[PDB]
Design a binder for this molecule. Structure first.
Ligand SMILES: Nc1ncnc2c1ncn2[C@@H]1O[C@H](CSCC[C@H](N)C(=O)O)[C@@H](O)[C@H]1O
Lengths: 265, 265
């Protein structure tokens, strides 16, 4: 009679919370989805071994089209778990699944876990100063979306930081690197000429958040555009005007050039 | 030989990540602070039992003034952990403590935990639509803080949602309720008269996120300002322009007035 949305965390199988793990172990059936994102630091097998239950993976169609036919039926006479990378419901479409549960007469509970949305706090930048977020999507064919560029402009104009989620082709396990994102942004700038993203723009790259050894680098596009930030996933941030304390952290912890203390503060 | 920043999570001792627990259990010394937030579902004893170590609790003064004299010295010859509610680097100044660690020759690592900043996803509102965040602080003496009012105004003008962290006076066991936050906002409104926060403003309240049964309520200030949302902690949200799906969730899950379904595109 109960459905549990359980978050898996940032990177590997140990990023789930103790609460999530224990609940998952007591569920009769355990489902999971890896289309909204991937758990780059582990494998389905390792997650299964930790939970001690076989995990049935669901595709985007399985969920968006048949959630009420695949998952909910079992939740009627059993405790069912639905695992998702990060924190449940941080992905825009999963909240509606709670409504589906309701109309099916199934109780649902959410077990939270760390999300890159909150993990960016490790960049040393004040979380309250992050504005609207955006996703840098790979262009394709005659389609060249650029709304993420406008988001940076609007945030920066108000002295706010911009968190940029990078595109991912989960099915094919293809990660967009911060380098590719920087190249795309420069391309958009050349098209729009808004003076929003250039070689002189200060950016911050956070790679493999959740890991004990994430890569945290800060600096100007001209210097970081071809730098190796390690394996995915990568997150890109365009800070607004920095608080001195934010800048000091980027310099001392993220290897930012001393120049940011007088140019970006 | 190292210092660990480990989050404890939203509500109880099981909100710590498996990663955080396994590491905490192997540290030689464990410190913690419980003034940045409130974990309403646990106690020091239960946390100690789970980790199997004695925990020395530090006050805001111990940390901000003497972190390098109380914690860092031991981290030079031992494995030390510093525990905090939620995520250690979200809506705190703990990030700066990493700078102190570096300058003291101590390597530090961060272990994330669920944060209220991302947990708001359970309100059904799109995470990317949250703009700048703010804190509603208790007036003191002749001092009446009001900056949070301007944050709401700036976000709303952009159609963005506003997350409002509520004040806390740990040593006095005072946890600002959503009701008190609403009362303060109405007073600021009377002064600035910007039409930002009135009895007709739609707001969302999330209390005790992390628990299995958090209170999630949406409605007009006039109706919710005297409603009982249960024990603290609470956070207040002022939605911007709602998506249909956002409104649908608030109605179905948060008991919001069905009239908000009719969006004024
Ligand atoms: N479980 C919870 N439910 C509702 N609000 C919460 C909460 N935990 C924290 N808050 C809110 O955030 C304030 C503390 S701010 C510190 C937040 C913490 N680093 C984190 O990552 O969550 C509280 O006063 C309250 O307004």
């Amino acid at each position: 009679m109960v459905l549990y949305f359980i978050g898996l965390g940032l990177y590997d199988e140990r990023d789930i919370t103790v609460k999530g793990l224990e609940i998952a172990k007591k569920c009769d059936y355990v489902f999971a989805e890896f289309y909204t994102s991937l758990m780059a630091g582990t494998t389905l097998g390792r997650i299964q071994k930790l939970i001690g239950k076989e995990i049935r993976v669901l595709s985007r169609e399985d969920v968006e089209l048949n959630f009420e036919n695949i998952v909910l039926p079992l939740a009627k006479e059993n405790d069912v778990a639905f695992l998702t990378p990060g924190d449940p419901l941080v992905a825009t479409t999963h909240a509606e699944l709670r409504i589906r549960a309701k109309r099916a007469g199934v109780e649902s509970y959410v077990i939270h876990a760390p999300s890159i949305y909150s993990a960016v706090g490790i960049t040393g930048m004040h979380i309250y100063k992050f504005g609207k977020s955006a996703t840098v999507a790979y262009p394709e064919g005659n389609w060249f979306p650029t709304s993420y560029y406008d988001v940076i402009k609007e945030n920066a104009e108000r002295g706010l930081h911009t968190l940029l989620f990078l595109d991912i082709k989960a099915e094919k396990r293809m990660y967009m690197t911060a380098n590719e994102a920087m190249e795309l942004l420069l391309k958009v700038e050349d098209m729009k000429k808004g003076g929003v993203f250039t070689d002189d723009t200060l950016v911050v790259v956070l790679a493999r958040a959740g890991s004990l050894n994430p890569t945290i680098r800060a600096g100007y596009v001209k210097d970081l555009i071809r730098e190796d930030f390690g394996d995915p996933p990568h997150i890109l941030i365009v800070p607004g005007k920095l608080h001195i304390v934010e800048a000091e952290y980027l310099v001392e912890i993220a290897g930012a050039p001393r120049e940011i203390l007088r140019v970006n503060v």
